Design a protein that fits this description.
part of a larger assembly; 2 chains; A: 510 residues; 3-stranded mixed β-sheet; two-stranded antiparallel ribbon; 36% helix; globular; B: 201 residues; alpha/beta; 5-stranded mixed β-sheet; binds zinc ion; PHIKZ055 (chain B); zinc (chain A); PHIKZ074 (chain A)
Chain lengths: 510, 201
């Protein structure tokens, strides 16, 4: 055929000036595995631009899934590549392909790659992609004018959805919105319009376009009370009745209730969570080699929380889930958690007990604070139904006595998992740390210290954990004078070590 | 727990839409003339025959006035950093909850326009803190030593690339902005070639 063939590493070893000097053609691309694709030069230019970490390692194999158009596969029959659809260029798709190119080098050699070098190669490849797409692409600038509005407004399928429509929620959200949502998703209708091509590329949202090109439906008051008669017009053809515009003006009234008590209480929640979460630290790579494997039930809703987690299968040693298993949806699988493994460090854990999330954490990074941080950013993004009630519920569960004191923490983890993951997307490796931070050995002897076997699982209150352990960390929380006049703090017990201990004593080494 | 540190600055932020690196900071003339005063005094007592009073008068006089000697001494002070791109500095956000709110950059260029009073930051680092151009003032500290600059490498723009939620996934702070993506959308997703039936016929 009249299709030139290019190898995988031949386009990668090419210069940056010779990469853009490619002829306009359809071409075959061979890969390191036993597959080959067909592509346009304007897509493989971006593909090579996102293959920047593969340039430093000229010995790893490049699979066929690294290309944007991996659906096109050259077979013996032409029915699989004649009229097919490739991949859509998205701001998340380039990041996902860079992530694939990083983990291809990570699983090329056997589990010995420094992840900070790959994390620097990712941002270096993103910077090179930005510096190449800014300078070389200057003739192709997106624009917006009155013609771009009149091109999409004058469509008959959009104009049919605005006439003869009953003022009903079913008649607007299902009937009127469906007839325009079925034509926004059509890839053979609006070719060249910047608004539809930006909508399909994940930049413009479709929720903001149904309130402009279709009927705007039922704005609310300050309270959550809907109105009987909705507004007829949209935002292209504006609202010009007094009643409808007065209803529409109340839609922007709820965007100003930004009192300082909310920003005070979320900072108080972060200061309450991180100061008690900061006890566990300094995870170590390796294996502690314990047979004290805990057991947890896996459901459908918490399957994303068990993504990076090692479990024990039959006739096998260890395996990680990674989140593609439709099975194991109702059984009780034996896992490997931090509760009950033996490391020589008194406050550290291993990599296999924490899961596959530990390799994404840098070496000099506290694993204790980042669990509360990963909870708190999603909580603040839920803050910014009644997320303050969820925050007070998590405060009462984690940093109070509202939980029933169970005998073992293996039944406390799935309850907190099904309470958290139903509304806040949080991995269970953070919840394991947040539960393990409230664990104290030998509560009958006042030995306020973290036990290394988690099978004990003795929980107490949050204030007794703040006052009766590590006074240098107790000086950072409220009510500083109460640990001072306590008779239990004037006797040398073996206790833990807070990071604040150096700021209290000025910075003395001993 | 620390308050009111020295060798610091606080100013509003702009962006750099240029061919540049992911860790580059552009300090303006008025901020750089007062943040580097004893450095300019050392350079004026070394390269020129001036006392410290005349050097202090030359530093404080040319804060709101551009001249070539202070700009050349700024270019020399940037060029003195042999293993780094410039002077290592730390950059903070006032709501500091995540990792990206505290980063370390390098001063690479002092601006010549005296009316521009703003620190210009990289485009790709705009996503890791919640920092926009809505009249917000952001803080900056200057690391004096090489050991302190090596110890501040634990907070870097490359440290928050990997996500802290999913085990094998790069976080969404690496995603490009709107007008950066839209030109590639208009370029790649265009009716550029005839289809595969017409191409081989
Ligand atoms: Zn372990």
């Amino acid at each position: 055929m009249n299709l030139n063939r290019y190898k995988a590493r031949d386009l990668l070893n090419l210069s940056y000036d010779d990469l853009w000097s490619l002829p306009s053609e359809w071409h075959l691309i061979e890969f390191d595995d036993g597959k080959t694709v067909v592509s346009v030069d304007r897509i493989t230019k971006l593909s090579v631009l996102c293959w920047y970490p593969l340039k430093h390692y000229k010995d790893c194999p490049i699979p066929s899934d690294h290309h944007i158009d991996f659906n096109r596969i050259l077979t013996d029959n032409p029915k699989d590549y004649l009229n097919v659809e490739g991949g859509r260029v998205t701001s998340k798709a380039m990041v996902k392909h860079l992530n694939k190119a990083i983990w291809n080098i990570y699983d090329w050699s056997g589990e010995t790659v420094d992840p900070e070098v790959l994390s620097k190669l990712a941002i270096e490849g993103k910077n090179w992609l930005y510096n190449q797409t800014t300078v070389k692409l200057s003739e192709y600038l997106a624009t917006l004018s009155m013609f771009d509005i009149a091109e999409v407004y004058n469509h008959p399928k959009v104009r049919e959805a605005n006439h003869n429509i009953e003022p009903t929620t079913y008649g607007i959200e299902k009937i009127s919105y469906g007839k325009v949502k079925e034509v926004f998703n059509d890839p053979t209708q609006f070719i060249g319009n910047s608004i539809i091509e930006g909508l399909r590329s994940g930049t413009q949202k479709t929720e903001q376009l149904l309130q402009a090109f279709a009927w705007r439906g039922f704005p609310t008051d300050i309270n959550s009370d809907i109105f009987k008669y909705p507004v007829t017009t949209g935002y292209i053809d504006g609202i010009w009745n007094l009643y409808e515009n007065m209803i529409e003006s109340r839609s922007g009234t709820k965007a100003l209730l930004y009192n300082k008590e909310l920003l005070r209480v979320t900072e108080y929640f972060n200061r309450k969570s991180q100061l008690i979460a900061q006890y566990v630290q300094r995870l170590h790579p390796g294996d502690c080699k314990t047979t004290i494997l805990a057991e947890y039930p896996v459901t459908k809703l918490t399957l994303k929380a068990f993504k990076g987690k090692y479990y024990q299968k039959e006739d096998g040693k260890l395996d990680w889930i990674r989140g593609n298993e439709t099975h194991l949806i109702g059984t009780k699988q034996k896992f490997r958690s931090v509760f009950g493994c033996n490391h020589p460090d008194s406050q550290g854990i291993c990599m296999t007990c924490y899961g596959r999330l530990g390799i994404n954490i840098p070496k000099g990074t506290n694993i204790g604070q980042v669990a509360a941080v990963s909870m708190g950013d999603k909580i603040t993004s839920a803050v910014l139904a009644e997320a303050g009630k969820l925050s007070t519920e998590k405060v009462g569960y984690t940093s109070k006595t509202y939980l029933k004191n169970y005998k073992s923490p293996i039944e406390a983890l799935p309850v907190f998992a099904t309470m958290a993951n139903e509304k806040i997307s949080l991995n269970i490796s953070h919840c394991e740390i947040l539960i393990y931070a409230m664990m104290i050995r030998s509560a009958q002897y006042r030995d306020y210290r973290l036990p290394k076997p988690g099978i004990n699982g003795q929980f107490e209150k949050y204030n007794r954990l703040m006052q009766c352990r590590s006074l240098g960390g107790a000086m950072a929380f409220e009510k500083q004078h109460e640990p001072l006049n306590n008779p239990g703090s004037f006797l040398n017990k073996m206790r833990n070590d807070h990071p604040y201990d150096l700021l209290v004593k000025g910075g003395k080494l001993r | 727990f620390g308050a009111r540190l020295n060798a610091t600055a606080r100013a509003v932020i702009t962006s750099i839409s240029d061919p540049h690196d992911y860790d580059e900071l552009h300090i303006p003339w008025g901020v750089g003339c007062q943040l580097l005063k004893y450095h300019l005094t050392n350079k004026l007592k070394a390269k020129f025959n001036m006392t410290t009073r005349e050097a202090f008068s030359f530093v404080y006089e040319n804060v709101l006035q551009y001249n070539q000697i202070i700009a050349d001494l700024f270019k020399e002070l940037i060029a003195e950093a042999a293993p780094y791109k410039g002077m290592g500095c730390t950059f903070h956000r006032n709501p500091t909850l995540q990792r990206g709110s505290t980063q370390q950059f390098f001063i690479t260029k002092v601006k010549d326009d005296i009316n521009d009073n703003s620190i210009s930051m990289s485009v790709l680092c705009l996503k890791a803190p919640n920092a926009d151009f809505d009249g917000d003032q952001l803080n900056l500290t200057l690391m004096p030593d090489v050991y302190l600059t090596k110890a501040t490498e634990r907070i870097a723009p490359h440290t928050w690339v990997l996500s802290i939620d999913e085990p094998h996934e790069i976080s969404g702070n690496l995603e490009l902005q709107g007008p950066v993506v839209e030109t590639i959308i208009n370029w790649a997703h265009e009716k550029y070639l005839p289809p595969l039936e017409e191409w081989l016929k």
